[PDB]
Amino acid sequence: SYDRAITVFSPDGHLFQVEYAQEAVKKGSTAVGVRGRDIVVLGVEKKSVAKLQDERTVRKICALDDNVCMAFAGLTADARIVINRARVECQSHRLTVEDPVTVEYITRYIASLKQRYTQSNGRRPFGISALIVGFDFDGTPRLYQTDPSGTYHAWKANAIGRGAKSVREFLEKNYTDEAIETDDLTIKLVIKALLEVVQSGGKNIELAVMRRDQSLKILNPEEIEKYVAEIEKEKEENE
């Protein structure tokens, strides 16, 4: 009894289709999220504006809350679908619940949606993983990751996509146990990670910052290039 399906198990017990969804996520581009001392930063790479293409339309970073934002890496159609579901869920929770939305609740909602979409015949699972950063952890920053297995986890800093194997080790190489003072330093570390882009140019990295109390903040290419220059100056110290 090989896989051939979504709701049957291999003789050793593994469900192969969720693994195939994991591989489909692995095909996607890089996405490395972190949480700092107070702020959370994000940087997406491999924009690859195709001359006639205008980059803005694709919206590789999307915000669906009073304050929460990131896209979902993988197939962008499932990304837009889950974007619509996240909009609906966050607005409904804010309108219906006595208190506003929290990052844990929306992360659990997304995980449960993926699980309930997987747990049936004739229903293709969402082959997309995401990195959620929220503000209201009782006024603290925190980061979650969502996996098409309908699973959610809480990272201090995580990477998914084409560089998932690499950047994570990079994180394990230098994610400072000292909480990042001057969260601009954490943003510079994120820029250094984005220097490991699929094109590695660093001139088209789209970055977002949110200080756990602020709304969504977007970093323009020139000011992001300023942090890239600071990181390059730090790197040139080896002389």
């Binding site: 593994h14 469900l15 969720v18 693994e19 994991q22 297995s149 699973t151």
Partner: protein, 407 residues
């Protein structure tokens, strides 16, 4: 871009050279041609022949025997006419040559010649004079072990009950037939060994072969499985005949799962031929005619897969289970493997055994070896408990070797 015009390659390979090009390529061509000249001058190398050390051989006896004796041809005997038993007459078959009616020589006797019997015969009269042994297939006769492995029962760890019960059948009746005969009991004649891979089944077979003292024949699945039909059955026939020739014999089948697969028909006939071979075997073990003093050993990793007729007692009388070693067995095998090494005297082996998960004896030998490589890579002439713990870690983590399906 235009293609490389002949002038373009000319200038490409001319302008870009060093001022050395001509000399060193010409010198290389001289290398090649001088090599060929040396080869032709020295001639070809003498392939030679046998020709044992010169002082060992010849004597005029060699040529005298060559010019005096007869290069006898070999013929299948058949149908002793025995028309009057004063001169019996025989039929002979010279393979791919002919069939003759012949008589004995002045040397051989009628009692010395039987039907078939693969006799020899002269080259022009075709009179029969030599008793020759029957044709045993070479690919069957090389199967006899001819050399005992360097393993004893003391090298097998933990399986005291298994080795006792197997020696009860494969060793005790040969060593002490008196116990069985004076008590008037018939001992078992077939032992099957089953268990997970790497538990020591082939090691037990090696120990038995070392302590057998009788004719021991190993058997492997690939040996029996020929391409042509019936040929494997033929080899098993010859193998059992060979076993009958010996005064008692031991037959060992390693991984009999290769041939003993249960018979099935609906698969468009299935493998069938392998089933035919194992059917000839299932007859030879117990069919018409008593098997003889032939005690038989099979070891397999899939006991349930074999055909039920092969599991049947009277052909497989005693079935033995080699399970994963217990803590005491793990300690014992660790001792046994550590006997040969140069290690610390104070190695607390039972600690290592209780660090071991449900590890087969193959894993024990592997971790012992990994400690050996740790010591050697450290260039130390003594293996230490630290080396053993790194070996345990290496082996266990290697066997353990996204995985988000876990809890």
């Amino acid at each position: 871009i235009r293609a490389l015009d002949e002038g373009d390659i000319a200038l490409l390979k001319t302008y870009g050279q060093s001022t050395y090009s001509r000399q060193i390529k010409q010198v290389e061509d001289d290398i090649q041609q001088l090599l060929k000249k040396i080869n032709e001058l020295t001639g070809i190398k003498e392939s030679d022949t046998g020709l044992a050390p010169p002082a060992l051989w010849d004597l005029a006896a060699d040529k005298q025997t060559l010019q005096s004796e007869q290069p006898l041809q070999v013929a299948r005997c058949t149908k002793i006419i025995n028309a009057d038993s004063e001169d019996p007459k025989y039929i002979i078959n010279v393979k791919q040559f002919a069939k003759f009616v012949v008589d004995l020589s002045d040397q051989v006797a009628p009692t010395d010649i039987e039907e078939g019997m693969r006799v020899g015969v002269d080259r022009n009269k075709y009179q029969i004079h030599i008793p020759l042994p029957p044709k045993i297939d070479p690919t069957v006769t090389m199967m006899q072990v001819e050399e005992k492995p360097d393993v004893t029962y003391s090298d097998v760890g933990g399986c005291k009950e298994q080795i006792e019960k197997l020696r009860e059948v494969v060793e005790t009746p040969l060593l002490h037939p008196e116990r069985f005969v004076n008590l008037g009991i018939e001992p078992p004649k077939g032992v099957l060994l089953f268990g997970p891979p790497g538990t020591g089944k082939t090691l037990c077979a090696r120990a038995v072969a070392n302590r057998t003292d009788a004719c021991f024949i190993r058997v492997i699945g690939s040996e029996l499985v020929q391409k042509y039909v019936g040929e494997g059955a033929r080899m098993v026939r010859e193998l059992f005949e060979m076993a009958r020739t010996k005064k008692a014999c031991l037959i060992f089948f390693d991984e009999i799962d290769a041939i003993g697969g249960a018979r099935f028909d609906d698969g468009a006939g299935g493998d069938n031929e392998v089933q035919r071979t194992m059917l000839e075997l299932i007859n030879q073990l117990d069919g018409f005619d008593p098997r003889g003093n032939i005690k038989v050993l099979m070891a397999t990793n899939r006991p349930d897969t074999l055909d039920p007729a092969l599991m049947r007692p009277g052909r497989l009388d005693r079935k033995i289970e080699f399970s994963l070693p217990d803590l005491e067995g793990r300690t014992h095998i660790f001792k046994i493997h550590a006997r040969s090494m140069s290690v610390e005297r104070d190695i607390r082996f039972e600690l290592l055994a209780r660090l071991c998960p449900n590890s087969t004896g193959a894993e024990i030998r592997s971790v012992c070896t990994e400690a050996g490589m740790f010591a050697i890579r450290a260039r130390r002439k003594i293996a230490t408990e630290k080396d053993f713990l790194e070996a345990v870690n290496k082996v266990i983590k290697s066997y353990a070797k996204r995985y988000m399906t876990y809890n």
